[PDB]
Amino acid sequence: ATKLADGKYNIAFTVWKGDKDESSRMNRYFESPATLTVKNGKQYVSFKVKDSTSIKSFQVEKDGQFVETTVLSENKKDNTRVVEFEVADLSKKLNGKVKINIPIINYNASYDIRFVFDGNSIK
Ligand code: HEM
């Protein structure tokens, strides 16, 4: 009654900071709306990642464990990539962590972020 039947959908997301509720800078890197692919009731979120060379790690939590996202495809001419992960409950705010490395300025950082999916946006 409540599930999404198998299919390739769209869903809008916004990225929030790890411990604060504020738009996250990742909103200018992670592109919405994400693609949403359903197979056997396995909900898969996938989207484009720009400036992909500086986002050298991107993980979201899976079953208590922060797990590194699955790159589906890359574009080296763009300096972007396409990543995928599963989200079982899209109501809950998805936890994620990104490591940002910008070698020339010696910027090496690791941040907490969270994804907020808009259910009413599915199509
Ligand atoms: C691809 C390039 C960059 C990305 C993706 C990035 C991303 C982020 C993220 C996600 C955060 C914390 C979470 C948030 O604000 O939503 C953050 C914090 C911050 N960033 Fe960057 N950043 C980049 C480059 C830079 C550069 C070049 C500087 C300065 C030269 C900078 C200065 C800062 C500062 C001062 C903070 C606050 C740190 C704290 O209070 O803990 N960022 N960045």
Numbering used by the authors: 30 to 152
Authors' account:
B. anthracis, a Gram-positive pathogen that is a potential weapon for bioterrorism, secretes two hemophores (IsdX1 and IsdX2), that acquire heme from hemoglobin and promote bacterial growth in low-iron environments. The NEAT domain of IsdX1 is the only known NEAT domain to bind both heme and hemoglobin, as well as acquire heme from hemoglobin, thus making IsdX1 a useful model protein to study the relationship of these processes to one another. The structure consists of an immunoglobulin-like fold with eight β-strands arranged in two antiparallel β-sheets of a β-sandwich. The heme-binding pocket is enclosed primarily by a 310-helix (residues Arg-54 to Tyr-58) on one side of the heme and a long β-hairpin (β7–β8) on the other.
The heme bound form of IsdX1 was solved to 2.15 Å by molecular replacement using the structure of apo-IsdX1 as the search model. Heme-iron coordination is achieved through Tyr-136, which is conserved among all heme-binding NEAT domain proteins. The coordination bond to iron is stabilized by the conserved residue Tyr-140, which forms a hydrogen bond with the phenolate oxygen of Tyr-136. The least solvent exposed heme propionate forms a hydrogen bond with the hydroxyl group of Ser-53, as well as the backbone nitrogen of Arg-54. Additionally, the side chain NH1 group of Arg-54 from chain A also hydrogen bonds to the least solvent exposed heme propionate, and also to the hydroxyl group of Ser-53. Two heme molecules from adjacent subunits planar stack upon one another (inter-iron distance of 5.7 Å) and the crystallographic interface is further stabilized by two hydrogen-bonds; one from the NH2 group of Arg-54 from Chain A to the most solvent exposed heme propionate from Chain B and the second from the NH1 group from Arg-57 from Chain B to the hydroxyl group of Asn-135 on the adjacent molecule.
